[PDB]
Design an enzyme around this catalytic site. Structure first.
Site: not given
Lengths: 461, 461
Positions: A165, A365
């Site tokens: 990210e 995730e």
């Protein structure tokens, strides 16, 4: 009753900065330096120096994770541990030896390695010397570091990720004060988002120059949560459309389609904050898309119109176009402040399938953080985290619907395997399948670990 | 009788290393180090430390070239003078001040500046640390250097060159011992030829990133002398074929066509000595061809079969495919060992015209060096170099015929304006229109100088 494709990967996700500790690490990253100088900014004064002691106890940690049904472990290699001289990417021999040890140990325990190159851990010396991710030179140094990783470990690692990210780096370092250096500067943030997108493209390019097996593939891990407008009213829709372009298209479009989103470029040009790009850099981005996508999802994202007009004299920020919105009647994780909305996983799956070519992807995730889990120990010392199993059930259910509609999802990675150090929040919230009592670094399977192992065996629930 | 198109530039050519002297120069280039360390390798023990005193006397030196009809002057900026730290291209203030003074003095004397970035003068510290042009890091450091020159002087310099004959750097540094480091190693030479093509394309991209006026253009200076076969026996035209691909197409095809000559790469491949190239590097080369061409011509190039088979057990050199040939009956510059053959310039003009899209080009060097010009001093100490005036008329006659077939030749630069320091030969052979008495650094115009000034005022002879 809820079943999953043949070959689905059941995994766990962590990162090096949150597990290893700083034992014998040559260089400080930005979080290392921040704890060293501002320990008051970290919960109970717990920094990353010991974390979950993975540097010392990796072999038994992997054995425990293997007991817990972890078929694949995604973690990260620290730039600040592998590399001696950042300018030439020369090697620190003890750092190389450590990651060789970790990887061989995964293999010895039948865990498939998933190796991500960067998880919020820029060397603080590169910030001091060049201002970090604002520098295109630093982007080149990164590629050199990635080359070393591929040359050293690509013989027994197939699955790679360039970044976890990048948006959290942009947000945290240059927008909201979450990450040292805590710069608050919109225009700089724009250039950093560009530079990391470019650093990722250049890393796919270098990866495939050195790829020898057809199994070797490299991806990026992004958060693709939809931006739900507050209402059908036009101002709430306009805030949503920008929030979508800015929080999702900014990275998904370059990484998967090879170009930045036209409407967003048009907007930032109008506001005079567009990044500096060269034709060559845009050609590199266009020529080297990722092989796969990692999706991180935890909670929904809702957006309404901004309080004041974006044309008011004020510092430029992406937030001038949208404001976070709290939905009445939301289902809450109350102690944590996070709404629970598993349907967004289905929305995510459909978007990838429809607008992004149904590129191979995984849930990189998904997890639940709870504080004071010692309240749920049974009379044998095991955390009865039924809330965690329930959370997994609801989200896996939404995921399987996305799959049944034809989405190309190939795995599910829990955050996390073992409780790990959550930046400034440290160990306040626990996410693992496996508890860590951090005074003695004693680790013990939670109840959800046995459920996860059993889920992988039936490939369903 | 022999007239030229309107606007034809009549100019002169030199380089920084051969004119300036090393006065207050911060860094040593390879030749500086070679002389400081083996002065015995240089004619009369004369090195580059004073050269033609251009550092001290640029103003009056320029006033004399203007008197000799130098309408435009090509020379070079030294990497080792302008740059403080090579890794960042930070600036040496005195170097910057010198080149501003030189450029401003040219325009005060109504000489148009033609600025070349590199003339055999690699910093010796970049060789010690990286092996020089073998390192793609050094290639980046040269682009940083080139960017500073553009930003500092692009406000009043329209015409630029990336390199003066990179093949001479390949040949001298890595094949035949002409340039310090005097490495003898075919494989490395192949990689250095490729790296320098890459530096030039990367410099062209940077230049057009910064160019603001449409007059601004950047070129490369090559030697395009045809390889004349000794006979039409198949062995000799096989040798002439390779000698052409290796000596001309190796640089001209990437520079102008955007790609390396395929049958050359095929043979370099079969022999196991191909350079290491990435797709990104090749795309950069395809996407940034030069704007114009500078041609250096002095003497023809004749080739016959090699004495032994290219399959013999020997280290790989390009010379295993061809051997030079001495044609019986050649017109010779005996005191120098050079054949005179002006028709070659007509052949070059036609090649550029038919096979390279008739790109704007100029003769960037042409001239004749003779030794002991004291012998032709008249009563007022003026060299009566009728041999130089004749040499020019014969080659200009050939050039004019090439233009009359339509070849897009736009100027003619003589080597040189003032007698300058010719590397290990120093001042043994003089090429200037202006004599330099090197013990006292006094410059007087030769007779050829006044002839050059009349030729420009008339566009013919």
């Amino acid at each position: 009753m809820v079943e999953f494709p043949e070959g689905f990967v059941w995994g766990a996700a962590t990162s090096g900065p949150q597990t290893e500790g700083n034992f014998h690490k040559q260089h400080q990253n930005v979080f290392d330096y921040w704890f060293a100088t501002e320990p008051e900014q970290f919960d109970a004064g717990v920094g990353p120096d010991t974390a979950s002691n993975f540097y010392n106890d990796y072999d038994h940690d992997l054995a425990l994770m293997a007991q817990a049904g972890v078929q694949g472990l995604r973690t990260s290699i620290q730039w600040t541990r592998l590399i001696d001289d950042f300018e030439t990417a020369s090697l620190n021999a003890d750092g190389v030896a450590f990651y060789n040890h970790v990887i061989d140990s995964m293999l010895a325990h039948h865990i498939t390695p998933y190796i991500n190159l960067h998880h919020f851990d820029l060397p603080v010396a590169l910030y001091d010397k060049y201002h970090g991710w604002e520098s295109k030179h630093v982007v080149e140094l990164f590629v050199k570091f990635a080359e070393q990783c591929f040359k050293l470990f690509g013989d027994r690692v197939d699955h790679w990720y360039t970044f976890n990210e990048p948006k959290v780096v942009v947000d945290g370092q240059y927008l909201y004060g979450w990450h040292y250096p805590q710069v608050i500067n919109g225009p700089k943030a724009v250039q950093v988002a560009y530079n990391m997108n470019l650093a990722s493209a250049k890393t796919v390019a270098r990866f495939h120059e050195l790829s020898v097996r057809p199994e070797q593939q490299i991806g990026i891990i992004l958060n693709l949560t939809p931006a739900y407008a507050a209402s059908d009213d036009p101002a709430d829709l306009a805030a949503a459309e920008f929030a979508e372009l800015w929080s999702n298209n900014l990275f998904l479009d370059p990484a998967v389609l090879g170009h930045f989103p036209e409407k967003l470029v048009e907007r930032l040009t109008m506001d005079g904050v567009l990044w500096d790009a060269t034709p060559t850099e845009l050609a590199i981005i266009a020529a080297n898309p990722v092989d796969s996508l990692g999706v991180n999802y935890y909670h929904p994202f809702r957006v309404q119109r901004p309080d004041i007009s974006p044309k008011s004299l004020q510092p430029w920020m992406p937030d001038i176009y949208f404001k976070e919105y709290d939905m009445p009647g939301r289902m809450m994780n109350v102690d944590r402040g996070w709404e629970i909305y598993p349907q967004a996983m289905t929305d995510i799956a459909r978007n990838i399938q429809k607008n992004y070519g149904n590129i191979p992807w995984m849930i990189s995730e998904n997890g639940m953080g709870v504080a004071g889990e010692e309240r749920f120990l049974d009379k044998q010392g095991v955390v009865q985290d039924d809330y965690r199993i329930d959370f997994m059930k609801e989200h896996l259910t939404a995921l399987a619907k996305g799959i049944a509609a034809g989405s190309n999802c190939q795995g599910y990675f829990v955050w996390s395997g073992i409780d790990c150090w959550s930046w400034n929040h440290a160990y306040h919230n626990r996410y693992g399948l496996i508890r860590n009592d951090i005074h003695t670094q004693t680790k013990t399977l939670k109840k959800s670990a046995k459920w996860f192992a059993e889920l992988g065996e039936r490939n369903g629930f």
